[PDB]
Design an enzyme around this catalytic site. Sequence first.
Site, PDB file in Angstrom:
ATOM      1  N   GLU A  97      12.702  -9.886 -37.122  1.00 13.03           N
ATOM      2  CA  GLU A  97      14.017  -8.784 -37.091  1.00 13.03           C
ATOM      3  C   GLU A  97      14.668  -8.679 -35.920  1.00 13.03           C
ATOM      4  N   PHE A 144       1.148   5.111 -42.871  1.00 10.95           N
ATOM      5  CA  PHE A 144       1.104   3.351 -43.002  1.00 10.95           C
ATOM      6  C   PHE A 144       2.690   2.782 -42.515  1.00 10.95           C
ATOM      7  N   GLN A 145       2.574   1.945 -41.204  1.00 12.62           N
ATOM      8  CA  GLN A 145       3.889   1.516 -41.087  1.00 12.62           C
ATOM      9  C   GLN A 145       4.976   2.662 -40.594  1.00 12.62           C
ATOM     10  N   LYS A 151      11.657   5.739 -48.264  1.00  8.25           N
ATOM     11  CA  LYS A 151      11.235   4.942 -49.433  1.00  8.25           C
ATOM     12  C   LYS A 151      11.638   5.839 -50.877  1.00  8.25           C
ATOM     13  N   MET A 173      16.894 -18.546 -13.202  1.00  8.91           N
ATOM     14  CA  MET A 173      17.823 -17.626 -12.183  1.00  8.91           C
ATOM     15  C   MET A 173      16.640 -16.955 -11.522  1.00  8.91           C
TER      16      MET A 173
HETATM   17  C1  LIG Z   1      -1.740  -4.648 -45.283  1.00  8.37           C
HETATM   18  C2  LIG Z   1      -2.623  -3.445 -44.848  1.00  8.37           C
HETATM   19  C3  LIG Z   1      -3.355  -3.201 -46.123  1.00  8.37           C
HETATM   20  C4  LIG Z   1      -4.291  -2.212 -45.554  1.00  8.37           C
HETATM   21  N1  LIG Z   1      -5.250  -1.564 -46.478  1.00  8.37           N
HETATM   22  C5  LIG Z   1      -6.187  -0.811 -46.179  1.00  8.37           C
HETATM   23  C6  LIG Z   1      -7.579  -0.718 -47.005  1.00  8.37           C
HETATM   24  O1  LIG Z   1      -7.543  -1.081 -48.182  1.00  8.37           O
HETATM   25  N2  LIG Z   1      -8.747  -0.133 -46.457  1.00  8.37           N
HETATM   26  C7  LIG Z   1      -8.767   0.643 -45.096  1.00  8.37           C
HETATM   27  O2  LIG Z   1      -9.722   1.049 -44.938  1.00  8.37           O
HETATM   28  N3  LIG Z   1      -7.432   0.401 -44.225  1.00  8.37           N
HETATM   29  C8  LIG Z   1      -6.425  -0.273 -44.755  1.00  8.37           C
HETATM   30  N4  LIG Z   1      -5.421  -0.731 -43.983  1.00  8.37           N
HETATM   31  C9  LIG Z   1      -5.151  -0.125 -42.592  1.00  8.37           C
HETATM   32  C10 LIG Z   1      -4.929   1.441 -42.583  1.00  8.37           C
HETATM   33  O3  LIG Z   1      -3.590   1.345 -42.458  1.00  8.37           O
HETATM   34  C11 LIG Z   1      -5.648   2.060 -41.094  1.00  8.37           C
HETATM   35  O4  LIG Z   1      -5.375   1.164 -40.271  1.00  8.37           O
HETATM   36  C12 LIG Z   1      -6.991   2.372 -41.501  1.00  8.37           C
HETATM   37  O5  LIG Z   1      -7.480   2.963 -42.724  1.00  8.37           O
HETATM   38  C13 LIG Z   1      -7.373   3.515 -40.520  1.00  8.37           C
HETATM   39  O6  LIG Z   1      -8.357   3.227 -39.729  1.00  8.37           O
HETATM   40  P1  LIG Z   1      -9.368   4.413 -39.484  1.00  8.37           P
HETATM   41  O7  LIG Z   1      -9.440   5.564 -40.527  1.00  8.37           O
HETATM   42  O8  LIG Z   1     -10.879   4.004 -39.235  1.00  8.37           O
HETATM   43  O9  LIG Z   1      -9.152   5.233 -38.174  1.00  8.37           O
HETATM   44  P2  LIG Z   1      -8.539   4.433 -37.094  1.00  8.37           P
HETATM   45  O10 LIG Z   1      -7.039   4.205 -37.109  1.00  8.37           O
HETATM   46  O11 LIG Z   1      -9.198   3.406 -36.604  1.00  8.37           O
HETATM   47  O12 LIG Z   1      -8.673   5.578 -35.527  1.00  8.37           O
HETATM   48  C14 LIG Z   1     -10.128   6.082 -35.126  1.00  8.37           C
HETATM   49  C15 LIG Z   1     -10.313   7.348 -35.617  1.00  8.37           C
HETATM   50  O13 LIG Z   1     -11.419   7.752 -35.106  1.00  8.37           O
HETATM   51  C16 LIG Z   1     -11.309   8.653 -33.922  1.00  8.37           C
HETATM   52  N5  LIG Z   1     -12.212   8.200 -32.687  1.00  8.37           N
HETATM   53  C17 LIG Z   1     -11.744   7.310 -31.832  1.00  8.37           C
HETATM   54  N6  LIG Z   1     -12.936   7.029 -31.105  1.00  8.37           N
HETATM   55  C18 LIG Z   1     -13.898   8.074 -31.273  1.00  8.37           C
HETATM   56  C19 LIG Z   1     -15.160   8.314 -30.789  1.00  8.37           C
HETATM   57  N7  LIG Z   1     -15.356   7.663 -29.635  1.00  8.37           N
HETATM   58  N8  LIG Z   1     -15.850   9.344 -31.464  1.00  8.37           N
HETATM   59  C20 LIG Z   1     -15.439  10.105 -32.384  1.00  8.37           C
HETATM   60  N9  LIG Z   1     -14.260   9.673 -32.961  1.00  8.37           N
HETATM   61  C21 LIG Z   1     -13.489   8.615 -32.623  1.00  8.37           C
HETATM   62  C22 LIG Z   1      -9.822   8.650 -33.567  1.00  8.37           C
HETATM   63  O14 LIG Z   1      -9.392   9.904 -33.154  1.00  8.37           O
HETATM   64  C23 LIG Z   1      -9.332   8.228 -34.866  1.00  8.37           C
HETATM   65  O15 LIG Z   1      -9.242   9.548 -35.722  1.00  8.37           O
HETATM   66  C24 LIG Z   1      -4.326  -1.429 -44.002  1.00  8.37           C
HETATM   67  C25 LIG Z   1      -3.390  -1.923 -43.228  1.00  8.37           C
HETATM   68  C26 LIG Z   1      -2.564  -3.189 -43.552  1.00  8.37           C
HETATM   69  C27 LIG Z   1      -1.557  -3.669 -42.676  1.00  8.37           C
HETATM   70  C1  LIG Z   2       7.166  -8.990 -44.752  1.00  7.10           C
HETATM   71  C2  LIG Z   2       5.630  -8.434 -44.643  1.00  7.10           C
HETATM   72  N1  LIG Z   2       5.421  -7.144 -44.338  1.00  7.10           N
HETATM   73  C3  LIG Z   2       6.849  -6.532 -43.599  1.00  7.10           C
HETATM   74  C4  LIG Z   2       6.755  -6.592 -42.121  1.00  7.10           C
HETATM   75  C5  LIG Z   2       7.928  -7.209 -41.609  1.00  7.10           C
HETATM   76  N2  LIG Z   2       7.910  -7.514 -40.034  1.00  7.10           N
HETATM   77  C6  LIG Z   2       6.865  -7.083 -39.338  1.00  7.10           C
HETATM   78  C7  LIG Z   2       6.888  -7.232 -38.004  1.00  7.10           C
HETATM   79  N3  LIG Z   2       5.631  -6.738 -39.864  1.00  7.10           N
HETATM   80  C8  LIG Z   2       5.764  -6.368 -41.283  1.00  7.10           C
HETATM   81  N4  LIG Z   2       4.325  -5.955 -41.869  1.00  7.10           N
HETATM   82  C9  LIG Z   2       4.501  -9.287 -45.127  1.00  7.10           C
HETATM   83  S1  LIG Z   2       2.905  -8.379 -45.157  1.00  7.10           S
HETATM   84  C10 LIG Z   2       4.537 -10.672 -45.551  1.00  7.10           C
HETATM   85  C11 LIG Z   2       3.927 -11.430 -44.508  1.00  7.10           C
HETATM   86  O1  LIG Z   2       3.705 -12.670 -44.903  1.00  7.10           O
HETATM   87  P1  LIG Z   2       2.650 -13.920 -44.278  1.00  7.10           P
HETATM   88  O2  LIG Z   2       2.662 -13.567 -42.772  1.00  7.10           O
HETATM   89  O3  LIG Z   2       3.104 -15.066 -44.651  1.00  7.10           O
HETATM   90  O4  LIG Z   2       1.119 -13.492 -44.859  1.00  7.10           O
HETATM   91  P2  LIG Z   2       0.880 -13.504 -46.510  1.00  7.10           P
HETATM   92  O5  LIG Z   2       1.482 -14.441 -47.048  1.00  7.10           O
HETATM   93  O6  LIG Z   2      -0.657 -13.946 -46.632  1.00  7.10           O
HETATM   94  O7  LIG Z   2       0.857 -12.116 -46.969  1.00  7.10           O
HETATM   95  C1  LIG Z   3      13.038 -14.295 -17.066  1.00  4.25           C
HETATM   96  C2  LIG Z   3      14.462 -14.074 -16.893  1.00  4.25           C
HETATM   97  N1  LIG Z   3      14.942 -12.908 -16.862  1.00  4.25           N
HETATM   98  C3  LIG Z   3      14.092 -11.824 -17.278  1.00  4.25           C
HETATM   99  C4  LIG Z   3      14.026 -11.487 -18.744  1.00  4.25           C
HETATM  100  C5  LIG Z   3      12.872 -11.357 -19.416  1.00  4.25           C
HETATM  101  N2  LIG Z   3      13.151 -11.181 -20.832  1.00  4.25           N
HETATM  102  C6  LIG Z   3      14.069 -10.971 -21.294  1.00  4.25           C
HETATM  103  C7  LIG Z   3      14.220 -10.947 -22.930  1.00  4.25           C
HETATM  104  N3  LIG Z   3      15.170 -11.057 -20.788  1.00  4.25           N
HETATM  105  C8  LIG Z   3      15.503 -11.583 -19.484  1.00  4.25           C
HETATM  106  N4  LIG Z   3      16.629 -11.361 -18.862  1.00  4.25           N
HETATM  107  C9  LIG Z   3      15.461 -15.149 -16.797  1.00  4.25           C
HETATM  108  S1  LIG Z   3      17.157 -14.982 -16.513  1.00  4.25           S
HETATM  109  C10 LIG Z   3      15.168 -16.712 -16.724  1.00  4.25           C
HETATM  110  C11 LIG Z   3      15.496 -17.483 -18.372  1.00  4.25           C
HETATM  111  O1  LIG Z   3      15.412 -18.744 -17.840  1.00  4.25           O
HETATM  112  P1  LIG Z   3      15.955 -19.950 -19.011  1.00  4.25           P
HETATM  113  O2  LIG Z   3      15.989 -19.092 -20.230  1.00  4.25           O
HETATM  114  O3  LIG Z   3      15.231 -21.013 -18.967  1.00  4.25           O
HETATM  115  O4  LIG Z   3      17.517 -20.026 -18.442  1.00  4.25           O
HETATM  116  P2  LIG Z   3      17.942 -20.639 -17.136  1.00  4.25           P
HETATM  117  O5  LIG Z   3      16.631 -21.562 -16.793  1.00  4.25           O
HETATM  118  O6  LIG Z   3      18.939 -21.417 -17.013  1.00  4.25           O
HETATM  119  O7  LIG Z   3      17.971 -19.719 -15.966  1.00  4.25           O
HETATM  120  C1  LIG Z   4      16.408 -12.711 -11.417  1.00  2.00           C
HETATM  121  O1  LIG Z   4      17.839 -12.886 -11.255  1.00  2.00           O
HETATM  122  C2  LIG Z   4      18.568 -11.552 -11.155  1.00  2.00           C
HETATM  123  C3  LIG Z   4      19.923 -11.416 -11.429  1.00  2.00           C
HETATM  124  C4  LIG Z   4      20.420 -10.327 -11.413  1.00  2.00           C
HETATM  125  O2  LIG Z   4      21.612 -10.019 -11.642  1.00  2.00           O
HETATM  126  C5  LIG Z   4      22.320 -10.916 -12.419  1.00  2.00           C
HETATM  127  N1  LIG Z   4      19.634  -9.049 -10.875  1.00  2.00           N
HETATM  128  C6  LIG Z   4      18.378  -9.316 -10.521  1.00  2.00           C
HETATM  129  S1  LIG Z   4      17.482  -8.104  -9.957  1.00  2.00           S
HETATM  130  C7  LIG Z   4      18.063  -6.629 -10.803  1.00  2.00           C
HETATM  131  C8  LIG Z   4      17.959  -6.406 -11.998  1.00  2.00           C
HETATM  132  C9  LIG Z   4      18.392  -4.967 -12.724  1.00  2.00           C
HETATM  133  C10 LIG Z   4      19.132  -3.876 -11.867  1.00  2.00           C
HETATM  134  C11 LIG Z   4      18.904  -4.479 -10.491  1.00  2.00           C
HETATM  135 CL1  LIG Z   4      20.086  -3.341  -9.680  1.00  2.00          CL
HETATM  136  C12 LIG Z   4      18.949  -5.538  -9.982  1.00  2.00           C
HETATM  137  C13 LIG Z   4      19.098  -5.750  -8.532  1.00  2.00           C
HETATM  138  O3  LIG Z   4      18.168  -5.907  -7.596  1.00  2.00           O
HETATM  139  O4  LIG Z   4      19.993  -6.516  -8.069  1.00  2.00           O
HETATM  140  N2  LIG Z   4      17.850 -10.577 -10.847  1.00  2.00           N
END
Ligand SMILES: Cc1cc2nc3c(=O)[nH]c(=O)nc-3n(C[C@H](O)[C@H](O)[C@H](O)COP(=O)(O)OP(=O)(O)OC[C@H]3O[C@@H](n4cnc5c(N)ncnc54)[C@H](O)[C@@H]3O)c2cc1C
Ligand SMILES: C/C(NCc1cnc(C)nc1N)=C(/S)CCOP(=O)([O-])OP(=O)([O-])O
Ligand SMILES: C/C(NCc1cnc(C)nc1N)=C(/S)CCOP(=O)([O-])OP(=O)([O-])O
Ligand SMILES: COc1cc(OC)nc(Sc2cccc(Cl)c2C(=O)O)n1
Lengths: 290, 585, 585
Positions: free
Chosen positions: C59, C121-122, C171, C485
């Site tokens: 995205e 969820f999400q 939704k 850079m």
């Molecule tokens: C594609 C997909 C499908 C899914 N389908 C399912 C499904 O079919 N079944 C399923 O179960 N989940 C499913 N989920 C996951 C679901 O969305 C949740 O993540 C999950 O159901 C919630 O986990 P949980 O209820 O165990 O609580 P958690 O999210 O794991 O949170 C932990 C809970 O326990 C509490 N807690 C934390 N630490 C302690 C502690 N030390 N003592 C006491 N309490 C504590 C916290 O306060 C919290 O309430 C799915 C996720 C995805 C991505």
């Molecule tokens: C698009 C999507 N969900 C929407 C979505 C979009 N973008 C992100 C970052 N996360 C999610 N969950 C799914 S579960 C499909 C992922 O396909 P996969 O990674 O190839 O796995 P599988 O094909 O086994 O379902």
């Molecule tokens: C790490 C960084 N800046 C910090 C940083 C970190 N993460 C993101 C998403 N953006 C920036 N700008 C730079 S400019 C170096 C990028 O190197 P490059 O993409 O290979 O280009 P170049 O080597 O010509 O400077």
């Molecule tokens: C790694 O290369 C670059 C380039 C650049 O300007 C192009 N600035 C920085 S550092 C920075 C980052 C954010 C804000 C500020 Cl005010 C600064 C700064 O201290 O000038 N680093």
Amino acid sequence: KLEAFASRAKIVHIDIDSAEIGKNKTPHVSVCGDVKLALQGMNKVLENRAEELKLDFGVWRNELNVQKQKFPLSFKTFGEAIPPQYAIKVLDELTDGKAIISTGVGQHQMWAAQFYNYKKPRQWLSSGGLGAMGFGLPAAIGASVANPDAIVVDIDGDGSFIMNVQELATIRVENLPVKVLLLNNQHLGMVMQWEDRFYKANRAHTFLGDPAQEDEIFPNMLLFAAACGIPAARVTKKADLREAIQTMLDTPGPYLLDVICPHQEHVLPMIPSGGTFNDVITEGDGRLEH
Amino acid sequence: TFISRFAPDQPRKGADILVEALERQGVETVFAYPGGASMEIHQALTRSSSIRNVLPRHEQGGVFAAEGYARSSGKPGICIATSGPGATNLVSGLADALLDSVPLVAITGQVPRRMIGTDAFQETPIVEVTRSITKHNYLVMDVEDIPRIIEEAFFLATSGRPGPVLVDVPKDIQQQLAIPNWEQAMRLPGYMSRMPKPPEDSHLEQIVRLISESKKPVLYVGGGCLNSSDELGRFVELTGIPVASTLMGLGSYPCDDELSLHMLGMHGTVYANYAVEHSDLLLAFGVRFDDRVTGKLEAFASRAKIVHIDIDSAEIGKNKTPHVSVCGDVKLALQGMNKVLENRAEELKLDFGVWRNELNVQKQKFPLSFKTFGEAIPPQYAIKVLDELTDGKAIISTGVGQHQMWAAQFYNYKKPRQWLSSGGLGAMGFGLPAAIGASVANPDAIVVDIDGDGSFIMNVQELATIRVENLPVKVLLLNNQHLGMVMQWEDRFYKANRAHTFLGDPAQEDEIFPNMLLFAAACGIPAARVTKKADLREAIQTMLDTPGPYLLDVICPHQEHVLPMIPSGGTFNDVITEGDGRLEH
Amino acid sequence: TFISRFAPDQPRKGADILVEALERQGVETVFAYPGGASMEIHQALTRSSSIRNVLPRHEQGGVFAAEGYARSSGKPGICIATSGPGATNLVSGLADALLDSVPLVAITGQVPRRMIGTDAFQETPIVEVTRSITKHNYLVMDVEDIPRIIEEAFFLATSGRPGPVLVDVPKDIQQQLAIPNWEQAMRLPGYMSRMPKPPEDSHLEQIVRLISESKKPVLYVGGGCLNSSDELGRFVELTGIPVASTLMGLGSYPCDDELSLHMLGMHGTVYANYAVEHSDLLLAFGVRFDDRVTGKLEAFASRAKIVHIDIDSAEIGKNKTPHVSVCGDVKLALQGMNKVLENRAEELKLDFGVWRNELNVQKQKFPLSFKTFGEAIPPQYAIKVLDELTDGKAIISTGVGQHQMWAAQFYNYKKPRQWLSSGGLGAMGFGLPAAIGASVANPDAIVVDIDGDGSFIMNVQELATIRVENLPVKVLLLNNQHLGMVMQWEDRFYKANRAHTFLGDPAQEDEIFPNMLLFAAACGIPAARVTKKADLREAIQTMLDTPGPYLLDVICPHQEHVLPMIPSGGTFNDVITEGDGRLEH
Ligand SMILES: Cc1cc2nc3c(=O)[nH]c(=O)nc-3n(C[C@H](O)[C@H](O)[C@H](O)COP(=O)(O)OP(=O)(O)OC[C@H]3O[C@@H](n4cnc5c(N)ncnc54)[C@H](O)[C@@H]3O)c2cc1C
Ligand SMILES: C/C(NCc1cnc(C)nc1N)=C(/S)CCOP(=O)([O-])OP(=O)([O-])O
Ligand SMILES: C/C(NCc1cnc(C)nc1N)=C(/S)CCOP(=O)([O-])OP(=O)([O-])O
Ligand SMILES: COc1cc(OC)nc(Sc2cccc(Cl)c2C(=O)O)n1
Ligand SMILES: Cc1cc2nc3c(=O)[nH]c(=O)nc-3n(C[C@H](O)[C@H](O)[C@H](O)COP(=O)(O)OP(=O)(O)OC[C@H]3O[C@@H](n4cnc5c(N)ncnc54)[C@H](O)[C@@H]3O)c2cc1C
Ligand SMILES: C/C(NCc1cnc(C)nc1N)=C(/S)CCOP(=O)([O-])OP(=O)([O-])O
Ligand SMILES: COc1cc(OC)nc(Sc2cccc(Cl)c2C(=O)O)n1
Ligand SMILES: [Mg+2]
Ligand SMILES: [Mg+2]
Ligand SMILES: [Mg+2]
């Protein structure tokens, strides 16, 4: 102190707000809903299984009944001076506990809560959570409009009363039968009490009178009432109190009764901030011993 | 007694104070990607002889790696990024850590204090942006606040309900010379007063009582139990109560144990969901009653007395009202109950054999199942083979989708923190970086990323990280050429109408696209593809036996559906048990 | 008269209303990545015969592509994502579009209305998260609000100072049947009352007057001039005032024109910075006085009368106080002044030859320069060859870093919207996806992504998108095996101490890592590597002449520095003109 509150009790909490359950204390049993409906459901069960349940808490009731007789609510009478507690107790008798009571915030508020026997809810209108002064007089206005045929009495303190004193104009203009039972201790009483208990009676801006004319009641609340064409009177001696309150009640329309009270009175009993039941204060006031 | 690289009376850069603050927290690994606003911090990191930096190729990879590190160890995960685009690249990880309750400390550089709010170069108000997706965050406005804030950040991240904490650090603060005070007291008077107390004997006796009176009890176990493996097992031994686990709770109670109902929920087993449906006592330990588990709340455990033990007071009674609740550490609750259960053992006469047999019937009539079509590879079977060849001892990280569910269903996790998967947020591209963090936190372990072709390619750049850092990360890529789970929903609810779910090349429709082997080759990672089920066992073994990183491209028929399935907002009666994306003859 | 695919009295899903709302805005291309919370929207998209979806592989690639689409066309860019992890993956793009003032409409699915706030969820509170990094955002709470909100979103995104607008759609709203009303009036009474008025003759006469009295005037041109190409050129013809451009303003006035001072600022030319330093009249058109341009504000144009024309009233007097200000469209201001300048032409006697000669001396004494070492490829030279072989007509997108600056310095842009680069946020990984959007918006154009090896690999997954969509995207990858850079700043300010800036494999230190050619091969994209300067010209030509996508891995010595350089917060006297990362003999 929460840890000491109901420390050995199984706690059942019924609240309509899910956010309130387990917030400060963890209940063993909880029901999120209207307590009105919960009571209905339990009453139904309690009546059917009545002979099955054999409910009897006489022993517990007697134990509490002993405490109620050894440590009841109490106030002291000094000469001909008016106990604020007694004044409120007389208002109860002369209104037959049927009056709608609004209050300000402070000592007078607590005494209004302690020494008036409320027979129904919505007889008691008082700021509890925020505890905002100046609430009493306007609340009485709203209460009187909502209940035109009722006895409405604002039991106010001299600090709380003056904050929204301007609403006396509203009362006269709208012709509302609002009664003001003003308990005048010339002080911000509750703050004064805390000064006595915790700051060695050191006064920090709690006196509301005029230091130049120290023994004069200031301000003259009767003249506030007169300004708004509201009949008013002052009573100082306890003997004249019963007839004075009756006159307030029997006089048609708005009325102000300036009840002069000794300021040394303390609200009792008192559990200090964050304290426990063992910390309870049962005796004492703002007077020095002989 | 900690040893500093500076004299106690010697001024040092704020950046150096920051890094030592990490050292004093026992931090040994960070995931930091440099930028101008955090250069001072990176300079300071090189002066450390105790903190290793694993440089990712994307900050999202950085934070996901920190998550894997955390989830696989119970330690806090630390990621560092620069201001602006660095910080915003962390956002998905932060939100993920918050929803899954993962202890994580994120540090971001910031523009100089005087330039904040002026739309400066690489300035995002990251504190404002991340306030609702972190447990707490900070904007350091003085160099003297650094030791205290770092201590608070780690404390908040790891205590109570664990979560992500972000610390934003302006560049001029990093540069400023100062003498740190490490004896500063934390300013969290509110948070610490509301920290859950140890469970009273009163509450625990009531629960034990309910157990003795129940005839159909079910354990409902989740991610809150990750530290209570031994206590929970002791509890099950004493009570003999069957265990249903959430996606987040896998491993807490071993999957291949006799009393395991496996996973409940949307894609939970028929018998696990059956058990909760017909239970009269629900022991909800470390769960949060998610819609993905409960479906229609009114129908969830409709005839069961519900006991809920959670460390977050905000979670109790949120979605469902418990009859009995305990706000505290489930680890301590289990200990207290185990003590009571053992003393009053002969007094209690616990026996749920009738209930267990009833569930045992469901487990034999409606078990997990998959179909084998010709020589094609069932994704379920591949995961089942990985289990056998790793003896269920591997640390598994996954992406999100069908492969994620199959990884949850067909691998028997023997301990918690073997299962690293995005549950609450469900973020794709989580698998590969999480495996990286897991492998750094567990160098002698078998680490396998069971990934989908969609999820894998999102952060494919982290293959570079894996080779450079020489991490023995295994990638079991289940390749169905589709966004599988979205494809499944299309099949069920939209008459199989494809809306941008095919990930291959429509021009060369029968070619596997992209060629994931060449991604691996680009990063010097040995790789292979397997298509026929016969060659699968030897292929996975080769992946495991080959030292270092390895990619296995497992080609699967895309018509496979995750089963069983309770549709969104549905009940147990709505469960789908048969069918796939294939048309009949 | 627009033609709907539905009867005006026929109920339709909210998702269908949404897509038609886009159709009525003239939208023809979206960049949408499906998820459960946005499936309804994607289903509706397939019913459209006028809107094409380009499915990205991430995205972030989706939103960056929308940006490239926007920047290269002047149209709004539209990206769509699902709830949660989909939405959070857009964040960098949103912040980028806000800082660079790019018209963009982002649509995200959301959990059902009743489930909002329940940690579903999400679910991410994306509206809360993105409030400070968008021009405006919406949470649609009724299906009837969809037509109005979409109209407002596009209006806000494209009017005044352009920017990103996010529309969050639950939704259940997408699923609900309704009959849309397209004649709803927008509710933006505040915004529309404060919309800038056309410039009064009064204000414009004052500016023209100042011009006639100045002896050293300089044009200070930026991203606010992208639509004023012809007007600005007419203005320069009439006045003969030299033109200094910002990074964002490149192309507004042609680079290879006689009166062009090229770019000013931190890495601006010596003569451009000189001109502003010694000017007595500064015409700041469509600029925002960035610290990267001004350095120390008190020293910036210290002896110049400053005229500032900006469409945002908030930008006038923000960092520097102008003597004369006009809040409005610079396009209209230029038209008004051109009219006056032509009538009173003989009356005004404009001649700045002396000033021009003074600057012309600086341009010949201190021009842009690069050094050639043996047979190695100067990155500057490679870009200069691309210019020659494309005749300066190519659309250039870049990543962020050294390669970005060299792309800005050594390519002569003849028109605005040839130059697509992240300036304010400076987000790496922007280059490749932006090229995608640019190519879709300009199918018959030469599109080249001049990328760095760090920036390129961040969103390398979008190579899949390029092949599948059959886009003629050329990648000129300047590979220095470093985060260049950051490396340069290490050399200048940290005694060349490397802190995680090397991107290759330390084990095989002299091998180019990763092998970017194999990334291209993975996605069926033809590619080649060039190392020796002699082979460079033919290599770039081959890239250009080969139909469709192409990757050219250009290997450059990493010791190269971007010059000249005015250090952070410095003045013109602090300018660095010589030196690199090499040690003397
Ligand atoms: C594609 C997909 C499908 C899914 N389908 C399912 C499904 O079919 N079944 C399923 O179960 N989940 C499913 N989920 C996951 C679901 O969305 C949740 O993540 C999950 O159901 C919630 O986990 P949980 O209820 O165990 O609580 P958690 O999210 O794991 O949170 C932990 C809970 O326990 C509490 N807690 C934390 N630490 C302690 C502690 N030390 N003592 C006491 N309490 C504590 C916290 O306060 C919290 O309430 C799915 C996720 C995805 C991505
Ligand atoms: C698009 C999507 N969900 C929407 C979505 C979009 N973008 C992100 C970052 N996360 C999610 N969950 C799914 S579960 C499909 C992922 O396909 P996969 O990674 O190839 O796995 P599988 O094909 O086994 O379902
Ligand atoms: C790490 C960084 N800046 C910090 C940083 C970190 N993460 C993101 C998403 N953006 C920036 N700008 C730079 S400019 C170096 C990028 O190197 P490059 O993409 O290979 O280009 P170049 O080597 O010509 O400077
Ligand atoms: C790694 O290369 C670059 C380039 C650049 O300007 C192009 N600035 C920085 S550092 C920075 C980052 C954010 C804000 C500020 Cl005010 C600064 C700064 O201290 O000038 N680093
Ligand atoms: C590594 C790196 C190095 C950089 N170094 C430099 C450098 O050396 N030199 C340099 O110049 N930049 C440099 N930048 C870019 C810098 O951060 C800013 O992006 C740029 O300086 C600001 O562009 P701008 O002043 O033209 O205004 P913009 O950011 O382009 O905004 C346009 C301005 O014009 C106004 N405007 C918009 N539309 C109109 C209209 N129709 N009419 C009137 N006004 C309008 C807007 O309100 C706004 O104020 C660098 C970026 C990076 C990533
Ligand atoms: C100052 C104060 N509390 C602080 C205060 C300040 N301001 C407001 C609006 N409300 C409150 N509660 C009290 S209770 C004293 C009020 O004195 P009183 O109105 O004359 O009543 P009493 O003397 O009986 O305590
Ligand atoms: C594409 O595959 C999946 C899986 C899944 O649950 C695992 N939900 C969805 S849709 C969704 C998304 C967020 C919130 C909600 Cl409430 C929903 C929902 O409508 O149930 N789609
Ligand atoms: Mg008083
Ligand atoms: Mg797939
Ligand atoms: Mg580089």
